[PDB]
Amino acid sequence: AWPEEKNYHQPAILNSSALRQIAEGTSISEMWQNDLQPLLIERYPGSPGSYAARQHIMQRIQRLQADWVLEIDTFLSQTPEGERSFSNIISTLNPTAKRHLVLACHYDSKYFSHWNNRVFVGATDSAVPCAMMLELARALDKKLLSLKTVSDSPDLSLQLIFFDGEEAFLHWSPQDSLYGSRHLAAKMASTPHPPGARGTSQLHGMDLLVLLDLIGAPNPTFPNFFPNSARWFERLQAIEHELHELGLLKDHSLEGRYFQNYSYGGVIQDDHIPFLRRGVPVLHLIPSPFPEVWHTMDDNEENLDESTIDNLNKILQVFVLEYLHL
C-alpha cells in the first residue's frame, strides 16, 4: 500500500514566523549572480554550453551540506541532425526512500541559427527554472540536511531533475522533442523501487512531479491544469495569498496574483508527458499565456522580472518545506 500514501499525504503548514524566516532566507541577487548568470549561454545538446551547464548545476549542488546524490543519465538518440548524446541530471536526497517529491525543469536551450549578432539563451526557457531549483536547494540546505537523520516518526524525501533535450531540433513532434524525459520516464518505469521489490517501480516512488517551465516574465498566470494535483495547486494559491498578506512579497497585488482558479482548454506538451501518461501526478508550473518573448532572441536577461522570480522562489520553498514536513 505504500504507493498510495501520496493520495493521503498532507502538508505541515508553516506559521507566520516560519514564513517570514523562509522569505528572509532566499537571496534573489545571490541566485542571479551565482546560479542564473552562468546558465545564460547557448546550451543545446553537444554544445560547449551543454557541457558547461551540466558542470555548473553539479558543482552548485556539490557545495551544499545536504546529502545530495548526483547521477548523470547519459544516452544516445537519433535526431533530425543525426545521433546526439543527451544527459539528464538527477540530484536525489535519500535515494532509497520509497517516495520522493520531484521538482524538475529542462536545462537545454533550443537551437537557433544566429540572428544579427544574437544567440538564443532561453532565459525563461528554462534557465530561470534551473536557477530557482538551485536557489531552493541552497536556501533550504540546513532544513534538508535534517533528512539525513533517520527517524521512526514518512519514508519521503526530495529529488531534482534537470532534463536534457526537452526542445525540438527542427519542428516539435512526438519523435523530435522530450528526448531526456521520454528516456528517463521509460527507465524509471522499468526499474524496481525500492531495490528488491516486486511490482513497484521508480515511478510508483514519485509522489508528485512539479515541473517548472517558462518562468521569469512579469505577471505570469498559471492555470490549475489537473484535477489529480488540484489540492496541491490550491496550496500554492494559499501560500501566495498568505505571503502577500504578511507583506513578504514584492511588487505584488491580489489582482496580479500568479496562481489562478481556472484550468486550460487543451493539452500542453512538455517534460511531464511521459510521466503523466504512466500515471504520475503532475503539478505543471508553466504559465498561460506563455511569455511574450517565448522562442524569440528577446527571451533574455533584460526581459526577466526580478521581483516575480524572487516571489515565486519564496512560494516554491514554502511549498516544498510544507510537503516534506520541514
Ligand X SMILES: COc1ccc(NC(=S)NCCCn2ccnc2)cc1OC
* Beta carbon of residue 213, minimum distance to ligand X (angstroms, whole number): 5
- Choose between 227 and 289: whose C-beta lies nearer to ligand X: 289
* Beta carbon of residue 295, minimum distance to Zn ion (angstroms, whole number): 6
SS3 at position 147: helix
Active site residue 213: yes
- Choose between 2 and 264: whose C-beta lies nearer to ligand X: 264
Which of the residues 35, 213, 240, 299 is marked catalytic?
213
C-beta separation of 270 from 211 below 8 A: yes
Q: What angle do CA 159, 164, 166 make, to 5 degrees?
A: 105
Is residue 299 near Zn ion by the rule CB under 5 A? no
- Of 9, 79, 10, whose CA–CA distance to 44 is shortest? 79
167 annotated to bind ligand = yes
> DSSP letters along 253-296, please?
-STT-SB-S---SS---STTHHHHTTT--EEEE--SSPPTTTTS
Active site residue 176: no
Which of the residues 42, 166, 270, 299 is marked catalytic?
166
Strand 206-212 and strand 99-106: the pairing is: parallel
C-beta separation of 281 from 222 below 8 A: no
Q: Where are the alpha helices (DSSP H) in 44-172?
A: 48-62, 128-139, 141-145
Strand 84-92 and strand 69-77: the pairing is: antiparallel
- Choose between 201 and 219: whose C-beta lies nearer to ligand X: 219
* Beta carbon of residue 65, minimum distance to ligand X (angstroms, whole number): 33
125 annotated to bind ligand = yes
C-beta separation of 99 from 156 below 8 A: yes
Residue in the structure block whose three cell numbers are 544516452: 75
* Beta carbon of residue 147, minimum distance to Zn ion (angstroms, whole number): 33
Interface with Cl ion in residues 276-305 (CB under 5 A): 288-289
Is residue 260 near Cl ion by the rule CB under 5 A? no
Is residue 125 near Zn ion by the rule CB under 5 A? yes
- Choose between 162 and 232: whose C-beta lies nearer to Zn ion: 162
35 binds, among ligand X, Zn ion, Cl ion, none (CB under 5 to 8 A by kind): none
By CB under 6 A, name the binding residues for ligand X. Answer: 125, 213-214, 268-270, 288-290, 294
* Beta carbon of residue 289, minimum distance to Cl ion (angstroms, whole number): 4
Which 3-state string (H, E, C) describes 223-248?
Answer: CCCCHHHHHHHHHHHHHHHHHHHCCC
Q: Which residues are part of a known binding site for Zn(2+)?
A: 125, 167, 295
Which positions are annotated as active-site residues? Answer: 166, 213
Q: Which residues are part of a known binding site?
A: 125, 167, 295
Q: Which residues bind Cl ion (CB under 5 A)?
A: 288-289
